[PDB]
Amino acid sequence: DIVITQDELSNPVTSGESVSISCRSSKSLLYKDGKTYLNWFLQRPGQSPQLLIYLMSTRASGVSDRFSGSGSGTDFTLEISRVKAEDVGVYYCQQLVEYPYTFGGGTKLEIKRADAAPTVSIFPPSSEQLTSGGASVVCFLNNFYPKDINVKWKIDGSERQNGVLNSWTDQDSKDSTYSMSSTLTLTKDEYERHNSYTCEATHKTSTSPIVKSFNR
Amino acid sequence: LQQSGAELARPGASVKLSCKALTTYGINWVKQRTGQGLEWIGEIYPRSDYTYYNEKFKAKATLTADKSSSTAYMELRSLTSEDSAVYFCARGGVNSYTSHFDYWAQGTTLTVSSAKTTPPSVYPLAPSMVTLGCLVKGYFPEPVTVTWNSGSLSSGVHTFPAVLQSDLYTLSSSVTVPSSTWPSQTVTCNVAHPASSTKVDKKIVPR
Predict the structure, then answer these.
(1) Which of A18, A42, A141, B96 is the most buried (most CB within 10 A)?
(2) A49: contact with B, CB 8 A cutoff
(3) Burial B89-100 (b: 16+ CB within 10 A, else e)
């Protein structure tokens, strides 16, 4: 099987600069018809891959003329002119010269933008959830940049790590920000034994942690 | 290309996925595990009844096509936890004469598990801009689809990847609207869970 190897980018990349994504093969992708059987795709979160380039250098219908393919034999580049916020996602190369067809491992692209403080919102357990013996305290940390962020929970002033689950988005293709959910899940029994619930975000945009709280 | 809906299957069972579009072009099937890359399963060119398999999938996958309904099928047999993935179909080209892998369907989420289907519990998250949300807890399997006001509220939405805790998934979705517009202009989350044939709408009202 032909092995395909991609290199990572020096992330984050700078808007308006050219970006080169590297793809290398363990065997020549040149076929006897004089064409080189290499494709390039972009995959966005929750979506299928989109074809950018086929046969090493042909741009697909509907793709920005900022995207071009180059290379020869075992060494290939996807060239992005004037990189834009909408170019964030994961770029794949693929060989089709020999069975089985094989893909590279993907190259994620992230873009630098202006620093942006998170919008922090805390929500106590709903009346509805408390009836089933569960108590989830939800905190959103939305539209921040850079992605570096630390979230802490406090119950009556003491830090709580057990029962915390975090989830976050990839960089937004429109505003170039990140967002995160932090959920502290307690039993109703433990929730009703404490009063103060705090979610605290440490981000470079504020000297002090950004804190939202409520009292049961 | 359009694919069939999400599937739950037992270990050892078979499933048959569909891909609706085949006179000139072929159909490729591709596997992707959550947070991992792409693996080619096989191709069929229904015009010439030609199929070719990745040797890795030879004993796992059978590709067929109904030319009349321009539908391609992939049957996966002897299912295991390692077959849990998103499966895509994409168009297959002809040498230098066409594009290749140029139209991909949305994918089908296949989960292989002994665990029972469980619909989501949807809980409202209420307090110049206001943030609301919905907590989607205790469902199995993936996926869920979350919209706000049946898709008419799409700016200012964040829907987070699910996490798996004690064999059940949980995710949350937030929406941010101008403060003067809530509760005067209603905000409702809609949570569709294909595997349980269930959709739940929760209107967000002040606590």
Answers:
(1) A141
(2) yes
(3) bbbbbeeeeebb
